[PDB]
Amino acid sequence: MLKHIISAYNFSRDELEDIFALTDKYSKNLNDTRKILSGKTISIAFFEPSTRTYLSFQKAIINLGGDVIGFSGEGENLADTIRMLNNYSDGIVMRHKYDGASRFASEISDIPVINAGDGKHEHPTQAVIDIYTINKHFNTIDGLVFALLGDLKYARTVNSLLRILTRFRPKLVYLISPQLLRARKEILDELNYPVKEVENPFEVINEVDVLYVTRIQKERFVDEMEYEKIKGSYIVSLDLANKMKKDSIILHPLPRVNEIDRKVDKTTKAKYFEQASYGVPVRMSILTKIYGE
Amino acid sequence: MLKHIISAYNFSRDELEDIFALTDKYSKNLNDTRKILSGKTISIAFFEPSTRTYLSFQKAIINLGGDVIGFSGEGENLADTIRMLNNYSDGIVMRHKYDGASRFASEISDIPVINAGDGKHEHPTQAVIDIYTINKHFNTIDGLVFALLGDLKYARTVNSLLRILTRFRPKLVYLISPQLLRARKEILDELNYPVKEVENPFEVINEVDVLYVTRIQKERFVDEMEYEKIKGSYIVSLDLANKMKKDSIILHPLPRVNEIDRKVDKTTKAKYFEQASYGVPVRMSILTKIYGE
Amino acid sequence: MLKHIISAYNFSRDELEDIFALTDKYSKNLNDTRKILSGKTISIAFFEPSTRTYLSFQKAIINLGGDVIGFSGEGENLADTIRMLNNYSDGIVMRHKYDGASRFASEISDIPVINAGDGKHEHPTQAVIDIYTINKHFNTIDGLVFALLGDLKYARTVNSLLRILTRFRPKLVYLISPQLLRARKEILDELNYPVKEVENPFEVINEVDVLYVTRIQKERFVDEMEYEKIKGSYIVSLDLANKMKKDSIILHPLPRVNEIDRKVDKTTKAKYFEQASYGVPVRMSILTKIYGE
Amino acid sequence: MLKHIISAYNFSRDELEDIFALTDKYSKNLNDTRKILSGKTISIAFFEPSTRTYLSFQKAIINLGGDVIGFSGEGENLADTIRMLNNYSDGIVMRHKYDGASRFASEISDIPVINAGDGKHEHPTQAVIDIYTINKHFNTIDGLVFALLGDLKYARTVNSLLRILTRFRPKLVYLISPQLLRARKEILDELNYPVKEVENPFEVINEVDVLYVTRIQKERFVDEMEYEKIKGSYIVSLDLANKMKKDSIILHPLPRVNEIDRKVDKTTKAKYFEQASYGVPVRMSILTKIYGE
Amino acid sequence: MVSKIKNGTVIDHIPAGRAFAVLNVLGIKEGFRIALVINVDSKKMGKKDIVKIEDKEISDTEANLITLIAPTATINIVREYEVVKKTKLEVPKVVKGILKCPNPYCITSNDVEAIPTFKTLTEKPLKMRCEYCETIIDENEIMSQILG
Amino acid sequence: MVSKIKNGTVIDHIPAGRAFAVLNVLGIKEGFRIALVINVDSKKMGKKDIVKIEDKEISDTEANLITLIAPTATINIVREYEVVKKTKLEVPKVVKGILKCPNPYCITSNDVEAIPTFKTLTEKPLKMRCEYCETIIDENEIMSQILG
Numbered sequence A, B, C, D: 001m002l003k004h005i006i007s008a009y010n011f012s013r014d015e016l017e018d019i020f021a022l023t024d025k026y027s028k029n030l031n032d033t034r035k036i037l038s039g040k041t042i043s044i045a046f047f048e049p050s051t052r053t054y055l056s057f058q059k060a061i062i063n064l065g066g067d068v069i070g071f072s073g074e075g076e077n078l079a080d081t082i083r084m085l086n087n088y089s090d091g092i093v094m095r096h097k098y099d100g101a102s103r104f105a106s107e108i109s110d111i112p113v114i115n116a117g118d119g120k121h122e123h124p125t126q127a128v129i130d131i132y133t134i135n136k137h138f139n140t141i142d143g144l145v146f147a148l149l150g151d152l153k154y155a156r157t158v159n160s161l162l163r164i165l166t167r168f169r170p171k172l173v174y175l176i177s178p179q180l181l182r183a184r185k186e187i188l189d190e191l192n193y194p195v196k197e198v199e200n201p202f203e204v205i206n207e208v209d210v211l212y213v214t215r216i217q218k219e220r221f222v223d224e225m226e227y228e229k230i231k232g233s234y235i236v237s238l239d240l241a242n243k244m245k246k247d248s249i250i251l252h253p254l255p256r257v258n259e260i261d262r263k264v265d266k267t268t269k270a271k272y273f274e275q276a277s278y279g280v281p282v283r284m285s286i287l288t289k290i291y292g293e
Numbered sequence E, F: 001m002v003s004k005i006k007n008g009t010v011i012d013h014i015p016a017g018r019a020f021a022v023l024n025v026l027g028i029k030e031g032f033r034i035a036l037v038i039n040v041d042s043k044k045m046g047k048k049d050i051v052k053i054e055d056k057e058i059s060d061t062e063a064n065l066i067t068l069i070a071p072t073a074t075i076n077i078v079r080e081y082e083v084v085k086k087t088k089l090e091v092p093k094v095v096k097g098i099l100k101c102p103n104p105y106c107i108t109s110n111d112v113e114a115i116p117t118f119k120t121l122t123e124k125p126l127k128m129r130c131e132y133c134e135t136i137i138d139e140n141e142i143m144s145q146i147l148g
């Protein structure tokens, strides 16, 4: 049974399908949802701040009848902090700048720990949200052709997405990044489905069902010139959008800065706003599997 | 009757025993605790941030049916701020960097003010937690032999502890600190029980029932060398622990940094984790005496 | 005739040999050196600070009877600054953070401009010092086997060295750097002698007459781990030194940090201290060709 | 013979008397002083800035026909820096934040090194200036009664003064400081003349021939209150001045902040301005013993 | 060159110079007798080191940690003067404590209680994986961590 | 418990557990055989350690450094199997390299080439003085630096 949510690997195909169904139920926002967190306190421990993900979980918990305590920002030990939250609460949702922080927390902790981001490692509940969105659109995840675009090296969401896909059967996952930001050999060796590294999206854009973008950041390249020379071709432009198949979708776990042309918003292919809107019901679902079964 | 909680002196021996009993009751965490703060709003005004103590009070209040508003961090007057909280709330729990801030607040305020720390002055609800822990372990506070270890000059918790002990009859309180961090003459003259200043713990460690540690900080000594020369002997080490009596306990109001060797954690003498776990029920108790009687 | 010293390309083979002879003369520090800068003021305009190179030129100028004015550090125009120095002085020695600053200065200026470093572009008088040292040791520059070790991408001294070598006939120049810090295609296409890019020095160390090292800096790589994984093999260690031919030399334009093991200092192969000691007489020489012929 | 000037211990009684005579000569500022530094370059390497002492040495060197190069302020090695100055110059005057920097420099260096201040260790040429002033006034140093007032723990000038006095026969040296800033046991054990530690100057002020003051700084005490409680009695006030013997003198190696009441300036006992005015001729003298004999 | 042991563990066939690292690997550096010989002759290896620990029998778990720096090594358990056991050294599945994670952002590189933990990924060319952050280390990084 | 040595140095009567520190003190940790026994019986000391270094004769200078952590120690120089010399251990006048200066502002604490140097001030109660900054260290600070 689900307890700690630390890796996308924590989920089986069975648990995901269950979660999709519960998400469908919680989406059609009836006013009689079962208050499975009634009399329970979840702590939201965002050592590394993120207000979008903070609020998503809080709303999820509120919808389920839970009370919320937490903190955002700011030499005490992670271990000691985790022991403290165990006095105060019945589950912890944490985001942290150090890789493996959630795994370690879950080892110290008696109450469930949910990883809302650990360094550049994983963001497993995002991956659940991502594939729920895809599964909603295509009525399948199996057999789809994916393209990951942008930074594929330092993006926990990419990591969590690649790993969660291994519970399914994708036809192909294209990995479109500059040379510098390629998925780590380590991660690719875990995978059990066809992958193909490519540098320019226009070469394959016509094939993809799902285009998933992440931001590339200047403060990463050898010098500022390389970035400037490379950046313009990992932007989702209106032209790139128009070259996609009719039934294709564009995803992005927010926030965006400038990596998506805002004109894309108005095309029917843009799915990133719908993606963010499932954040709450999906996380309601995950919480329901942890505490309500 | 209890109203403002500003000093450990606010408590009588009678009120403390009552609080211990209520703490015992709230500890055995029944789901039918009386919601004495129902329809009431407590504001948590942490001008000086502390997340551990913030969350402790919030949980206490939640457990009692109260609503929580508050702030942590950040040229308005303390007085004006206190007047504002009186519009918004039915009690204030404040922590502040200025000594006497709680006393002054309680003079401006109609609603109860609870001191969660005022400069280097006091931390009275911590002292209640400290002695509750001791009384739980030994079934008494009278007749015990104490040793305060670390910084005994600038530690509000030490101050509050020394003052609260005067409602009891300790056999002896050892004051083990470097020369620089001795309890202030002012404070020691208030006391009504034997005290003895000493510099090295191993000289008396065999006698103490309760060892209570605080951190010594570099940014205090004449130069960085003195600190480095003195610091290693106010650390609670495994060796010091092993030299304590079988039935003795080690306390520390968290957070710790490095002043306790982490191997101590695994000995049965370590009581600082149990100490932190009474934070909520003890503060529930104090709130119950203020609003529920 | 020599006037502006902006690129290593400003020198012909003839001018270099002349400079070597004058350097030999000025080295044997007679007290009757001709005061060719008597009644002249050279300004030392170090917009980007460097005290080693500042002092080197100043001493050179002093030895030649010149007066020195200048500045080091600190929205006025470069052009306007250059116009100002033309009021005050008879030559300018400048170091600047912007590439091409010396070239531009020399276009605005009537008086000679000497480039003591322009961004990551060139450091031409260093290259003169470097080859003078080599020519002193081997009685030749032609036919030697070189190895450049460390950062070969962002090092003006490397740039100036590679370009100055084209007035000679090196047997081979090995380019030993991590993949990231390879000499720029642009620069390599200028060259008229065999070059060979290699990643590990121990593969070829046995062949080199001249080993020339530059520092690799963390703040350049994809992440801090790559640097840490790569850095230890571009360090000149005692082992690498011992593997060099008996008559071989190790050069480095100072300062060093940790890129040379300090035990190397005591071997007869270490030539970087001798290299720095020719700084003055070489620059005396260059000044002599500009003003004394 | 004098070469490196690193400690007040470098001077014998004989060398000091010689220096006093040369200072007398250079004081009566004749325009035919022998240019003993003609054709020589002294470098002034002030790693830790001080403009007063910088300018003093520079003027000394100028008066003696020397050329001056140097720097003030701003990961190169001290050793490497010292090796560089040896290329460029014939002597080094250095001030540095690290104790023992001058001693180490003088070990690396072939040319003379003069310590113009090394951390909190020594300032030996100041001590020469101090005793020259005293000897000028009283025609003796032997048999005088001294009082050191202010910070006697972290003041290199005090250190250098105490050590230089051991070449003489003081009747008594009073050490007047707050408890916290007492001369170090280490230093006092070196001394060969009566010393007496005292806390308040008015207790002994009537006996002293020479009152030598240093500043006490806030950023040193246990807390800001202690400083404020102690500071007002290590100030040289008009009252303290008036209580001194008719023929007594007040010294201070500048700069001052507020540790001397400015009304003292107008009394005939104030000697700190005369003290600073011997800086040049005294340092001329020291240079003369190093290079002109 | 060192006398025989009445009861305990003999670790023979350590590469020359590496005995000190073996003891570190084992956490030994108190009470019980220890003998080392360093740089002694070895017919099959040229030079070797031998470690002898009285009154302690190293487990197969403790023992496998040795293979990280001394895969040639042989472990003998000694009782009453007789060698009662000659352990088969294997590459350990998990390494807790001995190896640090090169990732400065790894939780194990920051929290004192977060003890570094590596799981062997392949024995073949030896690659190990940090269980917290997934960073991979090779035999080089491993040996340069323990040996120097 | 370790065999006799044909040629070299035997350092006997080291306090129990301190042999490793003796080797550090000597800069030894290559080529030549070394033997240690740790925690062996000693009639006069209860327990002791013995170090044996083949083919090296420790000088009176090197030897005196041992007195800092093993003042009881006895140094035997061995040739052809015969002990040809039994050194009188003395408190060394100067200690270069082994001990660091506790003053963070000492030049020896900042410049890699500035090697820490202590001059013995009194042997009696052992006090040493940093030659650069005059900081004083006692036997405690000395032993806690080398032993741990």
Ligand SMILES: Nc1ccn([C@@H]2O[C@H](COP(=O)(O)OP(=O)(O)OP(=O)(O)O)[C@@H](O)[C@H]2O)c(=O)n1
Binding pocket: E003, E004, E005, E006, E010, E012, E050, E052, E074, E076, E078, E080, E081, E082, E083
């Ligand atoms: N009571 C014992 C038995 C043996 N040993 C040591 O432990 C190893 C014992 O292995 P053993 O079977 O006795 O000798 P070998 O057969 O030669 O060992 P191997 O085949 O593994 O090389 C030898 O290094 C020996 O010095 C010991 O110290 N004490």
Ligand SMILES: Nc1ccn([C@@H]2O[C@H](COP(=O)(O)OP(=O)(O)OP(=O)(O)O)[C@@H](O)[C@H]2O)c(=O)n1
Binding pocket: F003, F004, F005, F006, F010, F012, F050, F052, F074, F076, F078, F080, F081, F082, F083
């Ligand atoms: N060829 C030798 C000679 C002796 N030793 C060792 O070095 C010390 C030699 O001291 P020795 O004079 O032979 O014995 P003792 O007289 O007992 O030594 P001491 O009086 O100093 O205790 C002993 O520990 C012995 O084991 C050795 O290893 N090789």
Ligand SMILES: [Zn+2]
Binding pocket: A100, E101, E102, E103, E106, E107, E108, E130, E131, E132, E133, E134, E135
């Ligand atoms: Zn890791």
Ligand SMILES: [Zn+2]
Binding pocket: D100, F101, F102, F103, F106, F107, F108, F130, F131, F132, F133, F134, F135
């Ligand atoms: Zn020192």
